[PDB]
Structures are given as structure tokens and as C-alpha cells.
Amino acid sequence: SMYGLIGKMRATPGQRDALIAILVEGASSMPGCLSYVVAQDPKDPDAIWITEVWDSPESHKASLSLPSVQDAIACGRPLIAALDEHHETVPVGGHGIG
């Protein structure tokens, strides 16, 4: 049973791109991650959409033991103004995620 997340963040003014770079870097080679997508929002220059698919909720929890994940949080937190949305989902079908 897979595990999904859908989140919307707002960066502090002018920091969207720096935060996006931190997220993308931080998300490489996390065991059990099937997809991780960071997106801008055309309607809001400060917003970031993050969508994630994991093989299990266990893999997502375990990912916090990764030094690179910890660094991304350390470096990223100062740039976060808000987390407006955060939805846990159960992916059941689809394409193009291996």
C-alpha cells in the first residue's frame, strides 16, 4: 500500500527559487520514493506545490534519518513563511513513476 503527499508551501518574499533548489536537492535518492515533484504556482509568486509518492508510509518516515534530508530541512525552514496545505493520500494507480 503506497503513500502520497500533496503540499502547498509559501516561501518568504523573494525566496521561492532558493527554497525550491533546497527541496529538489534534499529529495535525491531517498529509498522508497517513487516520485517527488516541486512546482511553481502561476497564480502566486511565493507558492510551491510539492507532490510525493512513496512505496509505504514507512519509507517516508525513514527518510528523516538521511543527512541530506536533514540538511534540506535545516536550510529550508528559514525560507518557509507557511504551509497552507498538507494532504496524505493513498496512491492506487497511474503511470510514469516506475
Place this chain on the structure above:
Amino acid sequence: SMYGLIGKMRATPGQRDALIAILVEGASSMPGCLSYVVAQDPKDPDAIWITEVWDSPESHKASLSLPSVQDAIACGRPLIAALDEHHETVPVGGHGI
């Protein structure tokens, strides 16, 4: 640019699984699709989340126009109680797609 969609809908009561089947069948092998994910919501047994990543908005439009995609939309309609959220996004980076 890449083009993303994040959508939430609710099926008519009890019809989530049948609607999900239609969505997953409908979205088969469309060209320029990098990611397509259909998901349940543990807090609402009728809810469905859809996320999509395309290599361009043009590829999205080209695939959306395939008769089989349109057929899926048509077959799905009676099973849809409501379309709740629909966000267009600009994916810029990530992994596994």
C-alpha cells in the same frame, strides 16, 4: 516549461473505486505524460486526488483530445458528485518521473 495539474474530486457515494478504475484506464500511455497518479483520501471515502506532470501544456492538450481520454471523462461523469480543487502548476524539478 513543464505543466502540472493537481485536482480533487468526489465520487457519488460508494462509487470511488469504480471512478478510480475509469481514470486509471483512461490515462493509459498518453504521449508527453511524465507522471499520472490517482489516489484515495483516508479521511474521505468518496474523495479522489489526481496529480499529473506533462513535458508541456501542448502535450496535455494533445492527449486530452484523444477520443479514449474523452470517453473516460464521459463514462466518469455520472460517477462524479463534485470537482473540488483544480490547480495548474509549473513543475520545475524533482525525481522519479
